[PDB]
Design a protein around this ligand. Structure first.
Ligand SMILES: [Mg+2]
Ligand SMILES: [Mg+2]
Ligand SMILES: [Mg+2]
Ligand SMILES: [Mg+2]
Ligand SMILES: [Mg+2]
Ligand SMILES: [Mg+2]
Ligand SMILES: [Mg+2]
Ligand SMILES: [Mg+2]
Lengths: 178, 50, 79, 116, 136
RNA sequence: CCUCCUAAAGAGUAACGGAGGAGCACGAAGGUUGGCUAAUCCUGGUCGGACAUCAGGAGGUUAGUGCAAUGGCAUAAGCCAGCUUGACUGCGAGCGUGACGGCGCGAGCAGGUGCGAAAGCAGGUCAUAGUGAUCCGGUGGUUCUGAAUGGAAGGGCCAUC
RNA sequence: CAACCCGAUGCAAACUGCGAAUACCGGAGAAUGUUAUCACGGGAGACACACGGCGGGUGCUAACGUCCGUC
RNA sequence: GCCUGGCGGCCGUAGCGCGGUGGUCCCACCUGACCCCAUGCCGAACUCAGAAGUGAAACGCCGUAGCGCCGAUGGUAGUGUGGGGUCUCCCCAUGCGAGAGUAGGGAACUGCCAGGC
């Protein structure tokens, strides 16, 4: 909860005045990181799936949820069932600890990262940016992996607006781009 | 069709038995499930089922 | 040419409209292929496999309309 | 609404109880409290009741809704619904997974004498 | 030359009319043709009339057609026995009844519109009349 | 044989009338207990593009239903999982529907099951198609009968091909 | 070039967020009706109908046409 | 009587939207989570032990008629029996009499038990 405390400390108040909030029980709280990584493919290999899973199982201290299809009406293929991903949301402590893991060592462990999207947000006020490629960060070994990786990440905050979404993260150490 | 008829026999010495169908083309495992044996008037384990 | 054929009788309907003698279990309504057309309620219920409004204990028939979203509902109070 | 969900879960048996028209023993739960009441078949008038929201019980209680605390609540409605000449009733966990406090109290009213 | 692009069914029962349509008064132009009689337009008539209608107004103004065929109407071949399956959809009729609003004009003098719908009802079974916009 | 219209708001109705389907499928796609709920669009997201997976918002049975159509379904019958064998045996108040043969619905009772803490639910599948009477025989069971008597062949009865 | 959506206008046997007359089913009541009603049993004949009215399929809302419902 | 919770009646003039609003009573979030129990990943949900905080969300109220919804009187359509004209349609007598639309209504009402003022 390292960064978690920071929220209650530096954050919250920063927003309480900047956003001029009336109740501490309003300040846009951080509502679990999601993580997905729609590996897909499978068919060709099928093993790369559990690979993309084991990879996530490392990126995160929890257990990957190898998701399935749904519509089946997919040109690519897919038939109702059939593996195709591994969301794996974040759990409170592990969540913030993760929010710490990255932004402090992940985003830092770049490839050429010269700023971060300031519009990866939504309408409600939630951000979700793709890493483009797993930076090999604290995962099961480094030079010991497989054909690339990459994945997606979403924050999702109680922010009533994308604007308020900016305040959050901004109060933290979100590198962003400006 | 492809659904052959099966004869679930009683594990008890009684010659009593049940009848139904099965798709041996995909379910080679001999079916058993336990039913009621009128003769002994007591439930038991019925067998025999392609 | 294709056009032809058709099912047989298949009555299914109200055979015990409103209050009736309602014996131990007449029918009150055999309008199969339903649940909402006629719902099992009151002293009467059953609603056999073929969605046939059973009708228990002897008495009169009511034919009501209760619960959220219309819902006919049949039952048999005492007489 | 997490509440709107719990309702439909019980809307089932709650209808089954009506079907049989048996005096059900409702039991609503909440973070800080544990309620209980024996409503009549008609589901309009309640015969008895006993909830942690009543001083008499709260006093003798450490913390409202503490299992062993959400037990006397049942033992109470029990006798309370026995001196009334009431007995042999149906339990309605009202959507609450029969396992925690609701699990208890039920054994309380059960042990107390209630038939169910 | 005006029929439905699709129909869940190939043939419709004979049926019949019952007078008094719905489109009583104009609600698009300010003139138009009225029913006055019960009948049915072979859809080919509605077009035959439209052409005469258009080619009279020169171009000025706009026109409307509140009537539509949608009705199959079959026919049985010549030398062919009876009762051997329903005939084949030959054309498409447009059931109309008294009060029915056939067409409608607006951007053209009533003197023209009038002397235009006449050159229309000439190519029509049902006896039509003339109508105005009417504030109500 | 099943479904809709024809069919005039009970049942039922004809045509070489207008339109489709069945001759099966499932040891789970049955039972129960526990839990879940869509289609579609918008927006924002590595490879993800018309169309995979993810996040939110709108949406509300327009999804789904093993297979036609109609009716039905959120207490879901629709979906997931645990454990199971009630797709049990003998009966059956009372009804519906047939000229008849017959077909259908069925609470409750007796014996034994299963699932559940429990109330309770289960006598196959959401229902309505998935079917062949009789005879002549085949198989298993039965101390019913068995042409002088004891057996036996054969016959009956029950299950079944 | 145009669907979706929005407002204005229609159409439907296999459309329905509405909805009659009315028929039908059951209950109570008076009057009337040589029991008209139901059950069982002896004897039947009859299962080519026709026209007209009304509601329809089919035909051309043709036929002293044809196939139903009903009088 | 004011407010709140549980359970029902009746199910749109009871709903939706929008604005205001209530709190450490009740409720809600909320805290903590080895554990009971739970996640085809997550203490999100269920589940347990409970502060600190806030009514923010939800919920409950109140106001508001923009979207629902209820909805006549009158006229219109249809129709039973009797009669009449008639190209397949319609008229008259007389009973029954819609649907839509208009007037207008309308921001639910109500019982039982419990807890706060
Ligand atoms: Mg009928
Ligand atoms: Mg996208
Ligand atoms: Mg089926
Ligand atoms: Mg009729
Ligand atoms: Mg004959
Ligand atoms: Mg004849
Ligand atoms: Mg005849
Ligand atoms: Mg003739």
């Amino acid at each position: 909860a390292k960064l978690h405390d920071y929220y209650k400390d530096e954050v919250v108040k920063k927003l309480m005045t900047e956003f001029n909030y009336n109740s501490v029980m309003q300040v846009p709280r951080v509502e679990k990181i999601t993580l997905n990584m729609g590996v897909g493919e499978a068919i060709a290999d099928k093993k790369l799936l559990d690979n993309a899973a084991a990879d996530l199982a490392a990126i995160s201290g929890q257990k990957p949820l190898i998701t399935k299809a749904r519509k089946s009406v997919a040109g690519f293929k897919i038939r109702q069932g059939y593996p195709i991903g591994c969301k794996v949301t974040l759990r409170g402590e592990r969540m913030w600890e993760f929010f710490e893991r990255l932004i402090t060592i992940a985003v830092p462990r770049i490839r050429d990262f010269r700023g971060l999207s300031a519009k990866s947000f939504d309408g409600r006020g939630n951000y979700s940016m793709g890493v483009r490629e797993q930076i090999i960060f604290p995962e099961i070994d480094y030079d010991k992996v497989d054909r690339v990786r990459g994945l997606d990440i979403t924050i999702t905050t109680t922010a009533k607006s994308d604007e308020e979404g900016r305040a959050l993260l901004a109060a933290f150490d979100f590198p962003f781009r400006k | 069709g492809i659904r052959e008829k099966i004869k679930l026999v009683s594990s008890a010495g009684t010659g009593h038995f049940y009848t139904t169908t099965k798709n041996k083309r995909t379910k080679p495992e001999k079916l058993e499930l336990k039913k009621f044996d009128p003769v002994v008037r007591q439930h038991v384990i019925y067998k025999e089922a392609k | 040419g294709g056009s032809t054929r058709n099912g047989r009788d298949s009555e299914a309907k109200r055979l015990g409209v409103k209050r009736f003698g309602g014996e131990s279990v007449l029918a009150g309504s055999i309008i199969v292929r339903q649940r909402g057309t006629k719902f099992h309620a009151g002293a009467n219920v059953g609603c056999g496999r073929d969605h046939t409004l059973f009708a228990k204990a002897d008495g009169k028939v009511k034919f009501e309309v209760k619960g959220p979203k219309n819902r006919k509902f049949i039952s048999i109070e005492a007489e | 609404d997490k509440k709107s969900a719990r309702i439909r879960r019980a809307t089932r048996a709650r209808r089954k109880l009506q079907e049989l028209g048996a005096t059900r023993l409702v039991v609503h739960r909440t973070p800080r409290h544990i309620y209980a009441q024996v409503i009549a078949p008609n589901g309009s008038e309640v015969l008895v009741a006993a909830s942690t929201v009543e001083k008499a019980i709260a006093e003798q209680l450490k913390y409202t809704g503490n299992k062993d605390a959400a037990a006397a609540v049942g033992k109470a409605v029990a006798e309370r619904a026995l001196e009334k000449g009431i007995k042999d009733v149906s339990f309605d966990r009202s959507g609450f997974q029969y396992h925690g406090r609701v699990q208890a109290l039920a054994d309380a009213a059960r042990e107390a004498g209630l038939q169910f | 030359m005006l029929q439905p692009k699709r129909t869940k069914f190939r043939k419709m029962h004979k049926g019949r009319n019952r007078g008094l349509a719905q489109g009583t008064d104009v609600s698009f132009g300010s003139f138009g043709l009225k029913a006055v009689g019960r009948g049915r337009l072979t859809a080919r008539q509605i077009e035959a009339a439209r052409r005469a209608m258009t080619r009279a107004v020169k171009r000025q103004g706009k026109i409307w057609i509140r009537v539509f065929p949608d009705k199959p109407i079959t026919e049985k071949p010549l030398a062919v026995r009876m009762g051997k399956g329903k005939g084949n959809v030959e054309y498409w009729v447009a059931l109309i009844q008294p009060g029915k609003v056939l067409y409608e004009m607006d951007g053209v003098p009533e003197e023209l519109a009038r002397e235009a719908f006449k050159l229309a009802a000439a190519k029509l079974p049902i006896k039509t009349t003339f109508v105005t916009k009417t504030v109500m």
